[PDB]
Design an enzyme around this catalytic site. Structure first.
Site, PDB file in Angstrom:
ATOM      1  N   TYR A   1       2.236  67.242 -13.753  1.00 19.45           N
ATOM      2  CA  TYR A   1       3.642  67.278 -14.182  1.00 19.45           C
ATOM      3  C   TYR A   1       4.531  66.443 -13.261  1.00 19.45           C
ATOM      4  CZ  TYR A   1       1.647  71.099 -16.897  1.00 19.45           C
ATOM      5  OH  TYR A   1       0.840  71.866 -17.706  1.00 19.45           O
TER       6      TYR A   1
ATOM      7  N   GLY B   1      -2.560  78.286 -16.623  1.00 24.59           N
ATOM      8  CA  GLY B   1      -1.513  78.905 -15.809  1.00 24.59           C
ATOM      9  C   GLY B   1      -1.948  79.253 -14.396  1.00 24.59           C
TER      10      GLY B   1
ATOM     11  N   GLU C   1      -7.996  76.679 -20.212  1.00 22.81           N
ATOM     12  CA  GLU C   1      -7.344  75.424 -20.547  1.00 22.81           C
ATOM     13  C   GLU C   1      -6.312  75.171 -19.447  1.00 22.81           C
ATOM     14  OE1 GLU C   1      -4.223  77.386 -23.675  1.00 22.81           O
ATOM     15  OE2 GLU C   1      -5.821  76.235 -24.612  1.00 22.81           O
ATOM     16  N   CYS C   2      -6.802  74.720 -18.296  1.00 19.69           N
ATOM     17  CA  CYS C   2      -5.965  74.492 -17.115  1.00 19.69           C
ATOM     18  C   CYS C   2      -5.498  73.052 -17.069  1.00 19.69           C
ATOM     19  CB  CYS C   2      -6.740  74.812 -15.843  1.00 19.69           C
ATOM     20  SG  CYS C   2      -7.084  76.568 -15.688  1.00 19.69           S
ATOM     21  N   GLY C   3      -4.261  72.849 -16.625  1.00 12.37           N
ATOM     22  CA  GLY C   3      -3.707  71.518 -16.400  1.00 12.37           C
ATOM     23  C   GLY C   3      -3.433  71.331 -14.926  1.00 12.37           C
ATOM     24  N   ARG C   4      -2.410  72.040 -14.456  1.00 16.51           N
ATOM     25  CA  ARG C   4      -1.894  71.912 -13.100  1.00 16.51           C
ATOM     26  C   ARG C   4      -2.966  72.028 -12.025  1.00 16.51           C
ATOM     27  NH1 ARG C   4       3.401  72.558 -11.840  1.00 16.51           N
ATOM     28  NH2 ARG C   4       3.720  73.910 -13.669  1.00 16.51           N
TER      29      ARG C   4
ATOM     30  N   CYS D   1      21.672  56.367 -10.381  1.00 14.31           N
ATOM     31  CA  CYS D   1      23.114  56.537 -10.328  1.00 14.31           C
ATOM     32  C   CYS D   1      23.488  57.899 -10.898  1.00 14.31           C
ATOM     33  CB  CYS D   1      23.796  55.402 -11.100  1.00 14.31           C
ATOM     34  SG  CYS D   1      23.763  53.829 -10.214  1.00 14.31           S
TER      35      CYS D   1
HETATM   36  C1  PLP Z   1       1.208  74.361 -20.490  1.00 13.44           C
HETATM   37  C2  PLP Z   1      -0.002  74.906 -21.157  1.00 13.44           C
HETATM   38  C3  PLP Z   1      -1.354  74.942 -20.527  1.00 13.44           C
HETATM   39  C4  PLP Z   1      -1.602  74.414 -19.140  1.00 13.44           C
HETATM   40  O1  PLP Z   1      -0.847  75.141 -18.188  1.00 13.44           O
HETATM   41  P1  PLP Z   1      -1.080  74.854 -16.627  1.00 13.44           P
HETATM   42  O2  PLP Z   1      -0.029  75.712 -15.991  1.00 13.44           O
HETATM   43  O3  PLP Z   1      -0.886  73.373 -16.434  1.00 13.44           O
HETATM   44  O4  PLP Z   1      -2.500  75.288 -16.364  1.00 13.44           O
HETATM   45  C5  PLP Z   1      -2.418  75.488 -21.246  1.00 13.44           C
HETATM   46  N1  PLP Z   1      -2.287  75.973 -22.484  1.00 13.44           N
HETATM   47  C6  PLP Z   1      -1.121  75.985 -23.171  1.00 13.44           C
HETATM   48  C7  PLP Z   1      -1.072  76.554 -24.566  1.00 13.44           C
HETATM   49  C8  PLP Z   1       0.103  75.442 -22.533  1.00 13.44           C
HETATM   50  O5  PLP Z   1       1.286  75.455 -23.191  1.00 13.44           O
HETATM   51  C1  PLP Z   2      27.304  57.065 -14.251  1.00 10.88           C
HETATM   52  C2  PLP Z   2      28.166  55.933 -13.815  1.00 10.88           C
HETATM   53  C3  PLP Z   2      29.212  55.303 -14.666  1.00 10.88           C
HETATM   54  C4  PLP Z   2      29.483  55.782 -16.061  1.00 10.88           C
HETATM   55  O1  PLP Z   2      29.750  57.175 -16.055  1.00 10.88           O
HETATM   56  P1  PLP Z   2      30.220  57.865 -17.409  1.00 10.88           P
HETATM   57  O2  PLP Z   2      30.483  59.286 -16.999  1.00 10.88           O
HETATM   58  O3  PLP Z   2      29.060  57.621 -18.353  1.00 10.88           O
HETATM   59  O4  PLP Z   2      31.467  57.107 -17.780  1.00 10.88           O
HETATM   60  C5  PLP Z   2      29.958  54.245 -14.146  1.00 10.88           C
HETATM   61  N1  PLP Z   2      29.777  53.764 -12.911  1.00 10.88           N
HETATM   62  C6  PLP Z   2      28.855  54.235 -12.046  1.00 10.88           C
HETATM   63  C7  PLP Z   2      28.725  53.616 -10.681  1.00 10.88           C
HETATM   64  C8  PLP Z   2      27.982  55.360 -12.459  1.00 10.88           C
HETATM   65  O5  PLP Z   2      27.052  55.864 -11.610  1.00 10.88           O
END
Ligand code: PLP
Ligand code: PLP
Lengths: 381, 381
Positions: free
Chosen positions: A359, A214, A252-255, A330
């Site tokens: 992430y 974190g 246990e760091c990720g970010r 889209c």
């Molecule tokens: C998400 C998570 C981490 C890593 O968190 P960062 O914000 O990326 O450091 C570590 N431990 C647990 C249990 C997590 O769910």
């Molecule tokens: C998302 C999208 C559709 C389909 O939308 P629905 O809400 O799933 O019917 C159709 N045409 C375009 C150009 C779109 O971006």
């Protein structure tokens, strides 16, 4: 600039620009610094959900003590670069399959998050005729994670009567993206006090505390990052202060480990004005780099200007406009940054999204609308 | 749940863990039969495959629809397995030179052009390949990144008409998403008709075709109040006559309305726990397999299959008549299917049946976040 030589080569070879680029040299320097700075009773584990790309894991495994993992897939990935006895396994919904797999491989610790999980793990351990070292994940005084503080006593007592279970201590992960190093030392202080108190009350030796991750990174102001050297200084003192020299510890760091060394780099396909507002349409999208949408922020970027024109008609060039950067998707939610002032941008230029290592790809819906994946480049010199 | 219960029972009887997408293809065929057969002779139904582009789904849909609407090279390729290129129509705000060339090489029916710059890039490819291409101009009526701002449409029409390789068929409108008001949808179509006729009359080119978009809504809050399709179609038919559009060919391009109600996401309860006064049920899988509820920030509708048997030597965890938060296996507090919803009874081992999971369920989800195995897919015939 780390990414500019790569962008020039791509442009020179007429390759489309839609890439994740990682600075492995920067990663190794960051890791060296972090791991060498810690006290001898505390080790860094990498929480791989931030970024579990095989090249990233391989580079990281040279420096960290091990991997934190939260599924059978992550165990599998960790086992490619570390032995099982340097893999620690957390998560609120460990399946019977995952637990049996973890037990079979001989993982270092399972971080148990509930009474029912303890009982499910125990039944597997009795069936396999094996033992397992655990921590109990504590949710200190609401999320779905760990054991609610007031329930912890009952789970300790149940754990201590199970002969197949070796209870090492506790696991705390209660904060996310903290940029304040002094606050983080105070949180570690609280974790020490609660772990010592349960250890005393229940009369079992406190061998180990997992202090979680974190540790934050700043996406708004890139110059103002987590004060790691300050944190570690006050962390070392705190350990003496609380007499924890004999207790083994891990983060246990990720970010914090990978965020700053990754970049999402994409070319400008179109520039248009719609009902007064300027848009720049980029190759790829938020299904490849969802971080900005997940956070609802304007992601930090720079612009590489490309001088040549591949077409026999003019570019669309603008300057000094509030511009919304979008991808190919889209949906109107496909936004990297909304109404950001841009000094100068043309079709054919390249946007470099910085701090994309954590992430970024890992949380993204890669195959929505069936676009080809970005190319992945890992810089080693 | 009448449809999925037999499947769940077989999965339980065979000791298979329950984490599945289940699709009712008989229901899908009946739904498509009704929709497509109700349309007037000059209107066609295309399926917008972004809603769900699973091969078996496309196989089933291809019988009943005129064609597929697609928005990437990947979707064209997927559509080409069951339709010829000349029954595929290609939209999107960021069509790459690679996608346009592929679309032209394959011979796609229409490209729905969204900018002057795209028009010029398409035309350069057509001059280089010595090909012609039927297009529509996507209009953004009076904002978003999509189509041509209404004010700019005249200029793009005139440019398209003097390019001999371009065949301008007419216009494409897609503004609305998830409209449940059938009467309002008729009024929107009326606007599209009047706008298209005006531009046709101003520039004196034949109004051959209008793409009326998708956006026919689905009701996730109250499942008994769905889009009044039969009402819409009757008034749509009348509007065509009043506005003298009988000799203009029309198409819809619907995703959500076609597949939403026939898909289910079903998953076993792994754990139930109370954390600082709040009850959580932890399910197998997660919002990385079914992100719809998180993307929309709603509580997705579900039912509970109450499983009678117990595989363990210890009792199930059960609660009754509590505000319960449904979460998956992920290690993030955002992994929420439903927040503080009433549950009359639930136990570990029960199955949650998330209804209306067919559209933008698996297709929008971040499948490999935390590296969990994919859910199984079952297609009922
Ligand atoms: C998400 C998570 C981490 C890593 O968190 P960062 O914000 O990326 O450091 C570590 N431990 C647990 C249990 C997590 O769910
Ligand atoms: C998302 C999208 C559709 C389909 O939308 P629905 O809400 O799933 O019917 C159709 N045409 C375009 C150009 C779109 O971006």
């Amino acid at each position: 600039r780390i990414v500019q030589p790569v962008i020039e080569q791509l442009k020179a070879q007429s390759h489309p620009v839609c890439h994740y680029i990682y600075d492995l040299v920067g990663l190794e320097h960051h890791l060296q610094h972090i791991t060498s700075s810690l006290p001898s009773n505390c080790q860094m584990y990498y929480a791989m959900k931030a970024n579990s790309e095989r090249t990233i894991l391989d580079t990281i495994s040279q420096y960290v003590e091990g991997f934190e993992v939260a599924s059978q897939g992550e165990i599998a990935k960790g086992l490619a670069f570390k032995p099982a006895n340097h893999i620690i396994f957390g998560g609120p919904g460990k399946t019977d399959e995952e637990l049996r797999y973890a037990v079979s491989e001989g993982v270092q610790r399972i971080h148990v998050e509930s009474m029912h999980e303890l009982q499910r793990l125990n039944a597997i351990l009795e069936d396999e005729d094996k033992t397992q070292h655990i921590l109990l994940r504590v949710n200190l005084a609401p999320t779905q994670f760990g054991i609610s503080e007031d329930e912890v006593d009952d789970v300790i007592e149940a754990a201590l009567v199970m002969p197949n279970i070796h209870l090492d201590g506790f696991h705390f992960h209660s904060i996310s993206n903290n940029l304040d190093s002094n606050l983080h030392v105070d949180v570690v202080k609280l974790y020490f006090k609660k772990a010592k108190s349960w250890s005393e009350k229940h009369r079992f030796p406190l061998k180990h505390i997992n202090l979680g991750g974190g540790i934050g990174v700043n996406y708004a102001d890139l110059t103002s990052q987590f004060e790691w050297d300050n944190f570690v200084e006050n962390f070392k003192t705190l350990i003496v202060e609380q007499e924890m020299e004999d207790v083994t510890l891990n983060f246990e760091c990720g970010r914090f480990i990978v965020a700053h060394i990754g970049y999402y780099v994409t070319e400008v396909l179109d520039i248009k004005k719609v009902h007064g507002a300027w848009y720049a349409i980029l190759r790829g999208g938020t299904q490849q780099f969802r971080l900005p949408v997940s956070w609802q922020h304007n992601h930090p970027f720079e612009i590489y200007r490309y001088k040549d024109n591949p077409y026999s008609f003019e570019k669309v060039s603008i300057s000094r406009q509030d511009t919304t950067l979008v991808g190919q998707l889209c949906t109107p939610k496909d936004v990297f940054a909304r109404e950001v002032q841009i000094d100068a941008i043309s079709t054919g230029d390249v946007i470099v999204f910085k701090y994309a290592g954590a992430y970024g790809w890992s949380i993204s819906h890669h195959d929505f609308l069936s676009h080809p994946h970005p190319e992945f480049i890992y810089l080693t010199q």
